[PDB]
Structure formats: structure tokens, C-alpha cells
């Protein structure tokens, strides 16, 4: 009542990474550096099309009042049952070979179902993911590569099979399985604060 704030504008495109068509694959997760805007997270919260919203940073009610340096939005597709692997700490296959979170990750992990859009009549063999690697992954590091993997013994000089397995494997999304085996589209919103001035945070409400 005592204070006034300027007219709202410049709502940066969260839809461009949410309502978009394709989310690439987990082994090549994109990275959108959203900055210089005023993102109204409320709509991303108050919606019935989002399944899991288990945040790990700040309470998802004041997030529209904390201004950070910039917010990184990652996006990819995963098996249904693995939606709980993105959480910090928990290990598995995609956790330590395709995507990992740091110990003190301070963002949020949106996920939702897309079985009606990412599976053709007989299923799509288009979404790849990693299943082998030399060792685990440090937080937030892509691993785009194709070099052949060796598990038992002997090298793999541009060969395949018998301890030269192809590092990437397809999912095989058949639109006739249970939820656990259906394609979930997942987005990770990681806030970042830095000595540089902040420029991204929710709108300041207005009144007469």
C-alpha cells in the first residue's frame, strides 16, 4: 500500500524450454542460460500438468522474491522410474553416467509425462542414453562423445562387440507399457548467484 513498482514486462520464455517440441536426449542435454528477465514461476507451480516437483534448494513459494545472477534451465527425457535418480546423492545409471547433481544443489527439478507425444505407433528408437563410462561424472559436465568403450580387456580400435560395446543405447519407448517405462520430460532449474549484480527474479506485484 505504501510502495509502488513499475509496469511489468519482459517475461522471458520459460515456454521456449517447456512447451517446445523436442528436448534432445539425456546424453546431450541442452542448457538454456535464462538471464535479464522477470520469470513468474507461479504459473510453473500452479498447474495440473506437472507430476513431480520435489525441490532441493529454497522453499518454492518465496522463489519469486530471491534474485540470483542467472538461472540455467536444462532439459531432457528419461524413463519413468528414473525420475527419482535426478535427486542429489542417489546413484544409479543416469545419475553417474548421463547426468549428476552436486551435493548442495540449490534449484528445482520439474518433471512430467509425455507418453502421448514421444512414442509413435510402434515406438520410437530415437532417444539415446549412455550405459558405460570410464568412471562417474562430476556435477554439470556434458559427455558428448562416441569413442568405443572397453570393459573386460584389450583395446577397441574402431571396433564393436565382445567388450567393445557401443557406449550409447536406445530406450525403445513402446506406448503400451506401465508408467515406469513411459517417457518423462524433465527440466532442471538451477539458480546461480555471483559477485556480479543479479538480474532475474519474479515479478513485484502491483496495487492501486
Amino acid at each position: 500500500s505504501i510502495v509502488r513498482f513499475p509496469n511489468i514486462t519482459n517475461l522471458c520464455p520459460f515456454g521456449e524450454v517447456f512447451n517446445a517440441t523436442r528436448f534432445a536426449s539425456v546424453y546431450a542435454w541442452n542448457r538454456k542460460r535464462i538471464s535479464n528477465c522477470v520469470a513468474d514461476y507461479s504459473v510453473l507451480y500452479n498447474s495440473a500438468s506437472f507430476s513431480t516437483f520435489k525441490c532441493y534448494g529454497v522453499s518454492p513459494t518465496k522463489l519469486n522474491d530471491l534474485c540470483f545472477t542467472n538461472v540455467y534451465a536444462d532439459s531432457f527425457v528419461i524413463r519413468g522410474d528414473e525420475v527419482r535418480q535426478i535427486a542429489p546423492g542417489q546413484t544409479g545409471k543416469i545419475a553417474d553416467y548421463n547426468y549428476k547433481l552436486p551435493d548442495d544443489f540449490t534449484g528445482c527439478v520439474i518433471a512430467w509425462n509425455s507418453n502421448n507425444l514421444d512414442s509413435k505407433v510402434g515406438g520410437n528408437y530415437n532417444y539415446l542414453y549412455r550405459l558405460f563410462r570410464k568412471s562417474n561424472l562430476k556435477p554439470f559436465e556434458r559427455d558428448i562423445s562416441t569413442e568405443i568403450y572397453q570393459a573386460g580387456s584389450t583395446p577397441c580400435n574402431g571396433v564393436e562387440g565382445f567388450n567393445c560395446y557401443f557406449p550409447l543405447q536406445s530406450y525403445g519407448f513402446q506406448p503400451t507399457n506401465g508408467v515406469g517405462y513411459q517417457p518423462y520430460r524433465v527440466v532442471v532449474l538451477s539458480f546461480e548467484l555471483l559477485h556480479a549484480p543479479a538480474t532475474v527474479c519474479g515479478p513485484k506485484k502491483s496495487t492501486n
Partner: antibody
Amino acid sequence: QVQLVESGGGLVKPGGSLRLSCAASGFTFNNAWMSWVRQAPGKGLEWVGRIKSKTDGGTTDYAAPVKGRFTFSRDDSKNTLYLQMSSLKTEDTALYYCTTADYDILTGTPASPYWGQGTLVTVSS
Amino acid sequence: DIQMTQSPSSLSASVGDRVTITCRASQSITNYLNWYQQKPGKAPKFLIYAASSLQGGVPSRFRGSGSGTDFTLTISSLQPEDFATYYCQQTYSTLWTFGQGTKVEIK
């Protein structure tokens, strides 16, 4: 790349001690097993024996046809395989091969790729 | 112990036919087995594992298959120089076994 060689053969009377050394050149020795096989002339190859790895003490998986005649030892220091035989026999005049054996990960079916050149054993009084 | 049968000791015919070789065993082994190739004057090499997937550098003409205790290795429109002795081999995951193959004779 990957290489394998054998040596230590000879032409001796039955009874004399004999050593066969198979040397593996430049793939790995300490993280894989190793096997020995027989290939008699004008005949199909036959099992001889394999041993385990990682200096666990050895499994001494001696083959049935040559039970209680030969012994195996993986010298990890020099990364080689030593096969010792004492009582030679005429029926044992067969080619000898050393090979790499280790089961896969996905299917888990043992097989023996990357075979050696072979060592010829001959006995004639 | 383990035993197996390798009746097809010699099977060759006009070049370009659908040659095949059988491998039968009395006991149960599942998919723990392999097939090798040996050309004259050279040590045998590694071609087929698990009776399903070939090995790198092997033309896809070779085709192994089967189940349980009976398996077969065939070839469609066999290529030149394929003539060689093909050996069958089995593993029980503890015990080992080989089998006499076929010495394809040029005719």
C-alpha cells in the same frame, strides 16, 4: 595393439622337465585370465586348461584328458604364463596354443579371442 | 562332466549355396558357447559368440542361432575365401568343451 607369443619347446626323452612360456605383448595381463589349448595334427583342437587371474591363488582348472600331468602359473612380475610338464608321452605330440579367455558383460558367455601363434611339441627317442 | 556331438564332420558343396553346420549337446548349457574359424596354415580366429552376435570384422553373411542344446551356424550366398574349418565350442561357466568341426573340401 595386441600381441602374443610362445616359446620353451624342445625334443627330449619322456620324463625330462620342460617349461613353456607364453608372453603377452601390450594389451593387458593383470586384469584378465589366460588359457592353454591343444591342436593335434590332423585332429580337432581340444581343451588343455585355464587358470584364474588377479593373483587370487589360482583355480588350477586342469583339463580332464591331461589330469595330473601338467601345472600352470601366471608370473605377474614379468607378465607371462609358465606351463610345466614332466612325463611326456607320444600321444601328447600336439600343437599347443595360449589364448586370452574372459567372459563378456552383456551376455556373459565366455570365449577365447586373440589367440597366439602356437608352440610345436615333438618327442622322438 | 560334459559331452557333445559333432556329427557334421565334412559338409561342402557348390560355391554359393546355403551351407550349414550343426552342434548338438546332451547336457544343458543355454547360450554359453562360441564358434571359431581356422584357415589352412594359420591359427584359428574368433568369429561368433553367444550364437547370436558376430565379431567385428566378420561379414554379416555368417549367421549362428539355436537354443537349449541344439545350435546351427549357416551362411547365405557364401563369399570367396570363406572356405575354412569351423569349430564349435561350449562352456558350462565352470567346465569347458570343444568340438570337431567341418573341413570344407573344394569340389
